[PDB]
Design a binder for this molecule. Structure first.
Ligand SMILES: Cc1c(CC(=O)N2CCC[C@@H]2C(=O)O)c(=O)oc2c(C)c3occ(-c4ccc(Cl)cc4)c3cc12
Ligand SMILES: Cc1c(CC(=O)N2CCC[C@@H]2C(=O)O)c(=O)oc2c(C)c3occ(-c4ccc(Cl)cc4)c3cc12
Ligand SMILES: Nc1ncnc2c1ncn2[C@@H]1O[C@H](COP(=O)(O)OP(=O)(O)OP(O)(O)=S)[C@@H](O)[C@H]1O
Ligand SMILES: Nc1ncnc2c1ncn2[C@@H]1O[C@H](COP(=O)(O)OP(=O)(O)OP(O)(O)=S)[C@@H](O)[C@H]1O
Ligand SMILES: [Mg+2]
Ligand SMILES: [Mg+2]
Lengths: 270, 264, 270, 264
């Protein structure tokens, strides 16, 4: 109960520091490129193209899902994946890479994964705005239900942050876990409604019931309901909302406890 | 006579593992034990106000460990250490990013130190003037020479006003012109009764800068007191060591190694 | 004609240095892991599993190709991909990361991409041996035709090396190219016979005729002919062999010329 | 009287770009021109055999650039430089990997230097004995202190026998005991008539070690000759600079900056 409290107070107090360090990191990563921070948008946009040529043109022979073209379905479902993947992968190594520079000074160590995740949140916001703009050319225009994004866009961020707060700590204790992380992420890409929709009524029905436990399922479906389907998502699927809230709460609690427990002996392990 | 820094029975152990597989073996079974290297042992220090203390010793003594523990970056295995004010440490290699420019480095470092923006806005000119870099304050730090990077780091660190300052081998690269300005800054700091630690291998600078001397041998504070007493003993020890034969120096080093190492 | 000669003499003379530096790099990368160099084998083996659960169990409903089970078809086709991908991606950044350490000393700079590629060749050899061992449980036993590997396994290495010898140089001149490289590699994964076989007689026929220009097509098919199909591959498809030899020759020539041209001004660009 | 190193009209230009976008602009159109910073200008040097030359100057003079160009790591924009033998350079920070152990670092560095294995096998013990690290030769370099890393780097570099040796600010961290041993090694090297360059900011060590002095000001070799002539002039210049007012020193630095910078 003390660890959760302490981490909460640190994150509440150092908001501006988190933002500014995230901006500095975004500046650092793209320093030598000629195009610069534009590569924060070009990199995912190209990847989607490949995922449309393979799974949309090759497989599916370009057929519609729920009366919507597959291109916009996939575009809305894919927007958060790059942010989630990159944020988790880099926040796992954040403390290991950045401990030495700030160890000599006094500076809260809980925010090291969060500011690196914030460095990746900006590209997600830009891509999501671009997606909403591009969805207009079909005839899909913004509605009232889009206000649901105010609940759904933050949640995704929170989820990612929580995971890093745990994994970063483990990354100091055992290095191998970092490698393991990559594999897990790949599974969460393919057992998700991003690229395909489970057929149900069969073994695919069991696959559907197993995919319902993936938080990526909830995030993708809620985004689609807010932008595409014109439907209040929380009316029919509030059980998923409660389950996901419980998942993020448990992740944050365990990560905070573990981080506070080993914080003083980080140099010995590192 | 307020004690600026107080030290009680500080002791730092480091566990020796030949390979990471031995680390795995002791992680699997808690009953495993390996040889332990004692970086420090039973150090007791009492630093007063308006004091300049120079730490002297041979390579591998444990002065950098003590300075880091005083700065709080390292946690003692056994013991405690308290400081009345906030401590700032100047190291041999300042932590700067070669990609960022001079002003960006000033902003980044002063944010990481714990300064809110309004102070940074008013403090930037003074640091820029003290650095003496000029046009190069606009170019990235990777283009700098080692002396200029040292000048920038010292300028950033000194402008923020520490209650306690710990300089560790930072003036080796600077020229005599910068050394005189640093000496004047040390005079100004001595005016404010702040406690300053000075670590250097230049005995002339230790004579010119400090007023008290602490002497550490093999992770043990050998002699703490006035410089006029401790420093001649250190010089006599150095000359005697230079007079010994190679075998005698080797056996002295082996005896120190046996004293430091233990299995527990 | 002088640049090609000079690079050839350097690589011929520094063979043992290349091998030993490659071994040191393999040692360095896996230093902190508890399992150690075992991760050079666990990492690809897990990925194949995912590529079998998605494309083999989900899509295709586990159907055979050419009378062979899909699992062994995919296993033989996937063995070189990780080596190719990692070698190209890291050899692109090799010179940029390693110039400073060896600049002060006198040491041939042409071998910097090659020893990093050699660090990745060892894992490919281990995985290929494991694949050949595991193919025996079906009833497929080694034959005379497997001697063809003596021509096919080296060629792949050569191809990768050539590409790096070019890209590394470009990576110093323009940083953005490094980023671009990633995208290109992804395309070469999906327009290849690794995961799927083009259906021909249609638009898929045009896709087949376009995929025939991919060197990965030739490498994968030749490996399958040597290990699985029991057939002298060069008897029917020698035109592909000649085209691929020409491709690697052109790549090596251009890369050698460019590397020798800008070698002295690398510090100014870097 | 063989000239060990000969220098003809060496000149190093560095192009200043405020941002990478300006670099893109000049890359697109070859007609674009930007201000150029002259690291060196019209340097002519002649080093004989059995000579110890100390380079002296203020921060940003261009001594490290000259040492790097002599070592071949940097290519001159205009001019040439030839060396009779093979040149070895000892720097302030030796290039070592913290993950590898001491013996692995010896093997890695001696392979990268250009030694075949058979020499390494017979040369390892001597380096191990000279290092004086002992048990720590088995542990990774990241556990070392700065003095011990410097000792290991110096031991590796000195054991290979250079025809020409260039030491640049490498003895700042070592203690007096290591400094005496390095001085004895310099005596042994002086016996073999090999040319040694010594860069240091400790004037006592320059007096004790060197025999000739070169003095560089603003990327220009101000005075080359016998130490007994050049060194008093450098000391007089330092004292005069210390006597000037802050505005006068600022205007001197501005004049040097204007002289070095140009648009061409
Ligand atoms: C079509 C396709 C199947 C389906 C397939 O081959 N299957 C599975 C069971 C039998 C059925 C068949 O025989 O058609 C597949 O699995 O991967 C693919 C990958 C990995 C693919 O990457 C790129 C394409 C592609 C892109 C554009 C255009 Cl214009 C044309 C193609 C592409 C198609 C398939
Ligand atoms: C089956 C499948 C289609 C085919 C599909 O959905 N299509 C395309 C046109 C209509 C047809 C259909 O409606 O069935 C697809 O595209 O991606 C998939 C991805 C990305 C998948 O990842 C994992 C599975 C999977 C793994 C194991 C088990 Cl036991 C079961 C599943 C999986 C299946 C498909
Ligand atoms: N992680 C570590 N594990 C084991 N020994 C260590 C570790 N870190 C430092 N040491 C040793 O602790 C001793 C004292 O460390 P330092 O304070 O860095 O050395 P030092 O006394 O400052 O000597 P200098 O800095 O070269 S003058 C040295 O023998 C180091 O090798
Ligand atoms: N890539 C570069 N672009 C522009 N200027 C550079 C570059 N590299 C070095 N310089 C400048 O060249 C000058 C001389 O370089 P150095 O030789 O490293 O300095 P120095 O004379 O050795 O002074 P020290 O080493 O601090 S005593 C300095 O003013 C550097 O800032
Ligand atoms: Mg130290
Ligand atoms: Mg220098």
């Amino acid at each position: 109960m003390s660890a959760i409290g302490t981490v909460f107070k640190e994150h509440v107090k150092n908001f501006y520091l988190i933002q500014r360090l995230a901006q500095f990191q975004v500046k650092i990563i793209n320093h030598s490129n000629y195009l610069g921070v534009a590569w924060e948008l070009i990199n995912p946009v190209m990847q989607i193209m490949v995922y449309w040529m393979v799974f949309g043109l090759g497989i599916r022979s370009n057929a519609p899902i729920h009366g919507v073209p597959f291109v916009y379905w996939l575009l809305v479902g894919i927007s958060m994946w790059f942010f989630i993947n990159q944020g988790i992968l880099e926040g796992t190594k954040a403390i290991t890479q950045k401990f030495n520079q700030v160890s000599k000074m006094n500076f809260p160590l809980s925010i090291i994964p969060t500011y690196i995740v914030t460095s990746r949140f900006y590209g997600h916001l830009g891509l999501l705005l671009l997606v909403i703009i591009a969805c207009m050319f079909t005839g899909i225009y913004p509605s009232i239900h889009i206000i649901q994004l105010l609940i759904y866009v933050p949640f995704c961020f929170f989820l990612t942050a929580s995971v890093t707060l745990l994994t970063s700590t483990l990354g100091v204790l055992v290095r191998d876990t970092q490698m393991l992380m990559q594999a897990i992420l790949r599974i969460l890409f393919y057992f998700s409604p991003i690229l395909w929709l489970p057929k149900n009524h069969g073994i695919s029905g069991l696959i559907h019931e197993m995919m319902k436990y993936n938080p990526v399922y909830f995030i993708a479906e809620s985004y689609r309901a807010a932008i595409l389907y014109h439907e209040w998502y929380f009316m029919d699927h509030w059980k998923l909302m409660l389950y996901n809230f419980g998942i993020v709460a448990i992740f944050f609690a365990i990560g905070a406890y573990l981080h506070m427990k080993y914080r003083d002996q980080f140099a010995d392990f590192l | 006579m307020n004690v600026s820094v107080n030290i009680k029975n500080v002791t730092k152990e480091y566990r020796i593992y030949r390979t990471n597989k031995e680390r795995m073996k002791d992680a699997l079974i808690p009953k495993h034990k390996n040889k332990t290297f004692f970086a420090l042992d039973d150090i007791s220090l009492k630093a007063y106000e308006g004091d300049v203390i120079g730490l002297v010793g041979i390579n591998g003594s444990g002065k950098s460990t003590l300075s880091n523990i005083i700065g709080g970056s390292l946690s003692p295995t056994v013991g405690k250490v308290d400081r009345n004010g906030e401590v700032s440490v100047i190291a041999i290699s300042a932590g700067l990013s070669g990609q960022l420019t001079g002003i960006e480095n000033i902003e980044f470092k002063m944010l990481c130190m714990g300064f809110k923006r309004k102070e940074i806005k008013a403090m930037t000119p003074k640091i820029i003037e003290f650095s003496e870099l000029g046009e190069f304050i606009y170019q990235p730090v990777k283009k700098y020479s080692s002396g200029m990077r040292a000048k920038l780091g010292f300028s950033i660190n000194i402008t923020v006003n520490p209650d306690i300052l710990v300089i560790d081998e930072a003036l080796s690269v600077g020229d005599q012109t910068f050394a005189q300005k640093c000496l004047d800054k040390i005079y100004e700091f001595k005016e404010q009764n702040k406690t300053i630690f000075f670590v250097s291998h230049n005995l002339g600078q230790v004579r010119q800068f400090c007023t008290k001397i602490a002497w550490i041998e093999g992770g043990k504070l050998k002699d703490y007191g006035e410089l006029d007493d401790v420093l001649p003993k250190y010089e006599a020890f150095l000359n005697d060591f230079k007079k010994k034969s190679k075998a005698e120096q080797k056996e002295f080093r082996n005896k120190l190694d046996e004293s430091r190492f233990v299995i527990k």
